[PDB]
Amino acid sequence: RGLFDLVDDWLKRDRFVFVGWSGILLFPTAYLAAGGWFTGTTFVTSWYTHGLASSYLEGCNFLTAAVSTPANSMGHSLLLLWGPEAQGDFTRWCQIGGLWAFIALHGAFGLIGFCLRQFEIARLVGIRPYNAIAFSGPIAVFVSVFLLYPLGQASWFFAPSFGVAAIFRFLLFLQGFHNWTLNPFHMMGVAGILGGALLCAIHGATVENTLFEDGDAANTFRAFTPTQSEETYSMVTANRFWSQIFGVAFSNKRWLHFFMLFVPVAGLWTSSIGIVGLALNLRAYDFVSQELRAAEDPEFETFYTKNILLNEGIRSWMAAQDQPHENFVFPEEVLPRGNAL
Amino acid sequence: VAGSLLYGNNIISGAVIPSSNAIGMHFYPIWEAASVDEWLYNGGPYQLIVLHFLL
Amino acid sequence: EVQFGAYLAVLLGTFLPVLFLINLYIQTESRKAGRDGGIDS
Amino acid sequence: TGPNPNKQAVELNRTSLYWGLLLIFVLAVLFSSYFFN
C-alpha cells in the first residue's frame, strides 16, 4: 500500500532483535549515553570543576573513575555544545563539564524509549502490560533524584556523579547534611527492597523443594518437558508446610505473583517522594521536644543526640574540600572535636 | 543514656542499650549482681535478650 | 513539649479507616448469609 | 427516572480485611512520632 504500511511491516518483522517504532528513540540515545560514559571515564578530567582526577589517563582505577558534575558557576544551564558557554570548541565543552549533561539528557530519553518498547512488544504478543509499571518504578527513581534534586538546589553541581566512589560520596553527603536516614520515606523504601529480596529467595526455595518425582536421576533439572499441562510442584504440601511453620501461607497462585510484583515498586515510589521533599530543603532533621529538653537539662541523652553530633562533625570536616568554590577557611581552633583524638 | 518510652523517648528514638564497657565480654546473669537495680544500671537485659534469641 | 493536634490526627486517622474496613467485611458477610437460605434469613 | 441497570455489589474477604488493618496500624505507628514532633 502506502509508504507508512511498508515501513510498519518492515519495523515489526522477526529478526535478530526487535526494532519497532520505539527503536528510533531507544537505540541512538542509549548508545550515545553509554558511549559518553565510557569515553568520559577514560580521557576526561575533573581538574577545572572539582579539583580532582577522575580518569584512567590520570591514574584512577575502576573504583575511583567518574564523570563529574559541571562547575557551580553554571547554575542550571542546559550546557549545549553550541550554547553561549562553550560556543563550539569541544575541548572547552569537555573541560567545563558538558559530558554530564550530555549523558543525563540522552539517558532520560533512552529510558523513555525502553518503556515505550515494552508497551509495543506487549501489544504485539497480546498480553497485559504489567512490565511497564514495574519499569515505571525505576524511571521515577532516576527522574526524581537525578533531575528534581539539582533543580531545587543551587546548581547541577549538587547532583550525583556517574562513578562508583562518587555515589558513596553522595550517600555520605546526604546523611551528613539532610539526616536522610531519619526520613520516614527511605524507611519504606528499605522495607520494600528487603521484602522483595526475601520474597525472591523464599519463593525459589519453596518451589525447588516441593517438586514432583517425574524422573529417575538425582539430577532433577532434566525432568521438565519445555511445556506441559501438569503442574511441576505441589501447592497443597507447600501450603501445609508454611501454615504449620509460620502460621499463615499463600493459597492463590495469582495473588502470590501480584504481591511479588507490587512490593518493590511501591518501595521505590515511596522513596521518590522523600527525595522530592529533600529537593526543597524540607528536611526531617530534628525532634523539637528532645532538643528543648536537652537544652534546658544537661543530663538528657539518647542515640538521636549522638547522631546529631555526628552530623555536625561530618559537615564541619567535609565542607572545606567538598565545595572548593566557596573558599571556606576554618582554623584548627574552630573545628569541633572530642577529647584526645 | 535513656532508652525507654517512660523516660522521654518516642518509637523512633527508643532502644535497648547494650551492656556497659566495663563489663567487656564477661558473662552477666541476674544472679551475679548485688541487686536488680545494679543489673539494670549496667545494661543487663541486653545479654539475656540476645542470647535467648540466638538460641 | 509535644504538639496537641497530633493526638487528634493520630486517633482519628487510625479509628476511621478501621471502622470503614470492618463495615465492608461485615456487609459482605451479611449479603453472603442472605443469599444462602437459612435460619438467619 | 426508574430502576438503574448499572447497579452492582461490593466485596471484601477476611484476608483483605487483615491486610488493611495491618497497613493502617503500621502507618499510624510509623508516623505518630513525627506528627508529635
Partner: peptide
C-alpha cells in the same frame, strides 16, 4: 502522656496479628 498512645498502637498491632493467625479463613 504520649507513651499511652505508643503502647496502645503497639498492643493493637499485636492483637491484629493474633487474630490473623488464629482466626483465619480456611484455605480449602
Amino acid at each position: 502522656m504520649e507513651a499511652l498512645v505508643y503502647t496502645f498502637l503497639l498492643i493493637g498491632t499485636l492483637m491484629v496479628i493474633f487474630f490473623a493467625v488464629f482466626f483465619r479463613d480456611t484455605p480449602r
